[PDB]
């Protein structure tokens, strides 16, 4: 009557190959709603699906806001109306992801790496909502993003090595949150520097494959530090 979990996962993999990320997100939402935990592979299919969907909406929103700002600094209400439509759709996708995280995926116990992964996702989608938010609502959204990232930070520090790619990615995104969203550039630079140095000190212990994965994210930290300093 319904579709098997394995078939939803297989079609999400096909949808990724066919670059049909809206379909991929729908298959992964269906697989999450089966109630079973996600594997490391399956967690990435969920994140890839929604990151691509919301990424396209974020990009469209920036284009429309850039046109709108230039139109003020061409005297029609259509630019504001259409930017508001894209904004509302983006918010709906973020609310869907955050709903999945809270109603199923995030648990009070279980695999630390998966919990960190999901709490980082929670911080990320509240950060995407903050990118388009204004006023007192923006203040609430920023607090929710910092809470999720901070909880993930606390768990990752006690449960994962400093070279873990998910720990590295979390710290990279939380430093971007500090720099771009919370207006805390000093904390952003401090965090990125600290994360890179702690990981560099431990790289000598890694296998060839682990070193490739960790150094891939360390290059993103290196890149932002260059940009910010």
């Amino acid at each position: 009557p319904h579709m098997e979990r394995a078939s939803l996962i297989q079609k999400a993999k096909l949808a990724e190959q066919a670059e049909r990320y809206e379909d991929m997100a729908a298959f992964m939402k269906g697989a999450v709603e089966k109630g079973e935990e996600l594997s490391c592979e399956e967690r990435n299919l969920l994140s890839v699906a929604y990151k691509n969907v919301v990424g396209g909406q974020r990009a469209a929103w920036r284009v429309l806001s850039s046109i709108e700002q230039k139109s003020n600094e061409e005297k029609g209400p259509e630019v504001r109306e259409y930017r508001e439509k894209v904004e509302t759709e983006l918010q709906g996708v973020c609310d869907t992801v955050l709903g999945l995280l809270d109603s199923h995926l995030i648990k009070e116990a279980g695999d630390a790496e998966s919990r960190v992964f999901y709490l980082k996702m929670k911080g990320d989608y509240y950060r995407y909502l903050a990118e388009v938010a204004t006023g007192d609502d923006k203040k609430r959204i920023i607090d929710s993003a910092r809470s999720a990232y901070q909880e993930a930070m606390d768990i990752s520090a006690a449960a994962m090595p400093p070279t873990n790619p998910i720990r590295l990615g979390l710290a990279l995104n939380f430093s971007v949150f500090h720099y771009e969203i919370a207006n805390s550039p000093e904390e952003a630079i401090s965090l990125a520097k600290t994360t890179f140095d702690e990981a560099m000190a431990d790289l000598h212990t890694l296998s060839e494959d682990s070193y490739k994965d960790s150094t891939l994210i360390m290059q993103l930290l290196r890149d932002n530090l260059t940009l910010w300093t």
Partner: peptide, 9 residues
Amino acid sequence: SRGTSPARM
């Protein structure tokens, strides 16, 4: 402009 982590890690 800066970068944030890839979707797949």
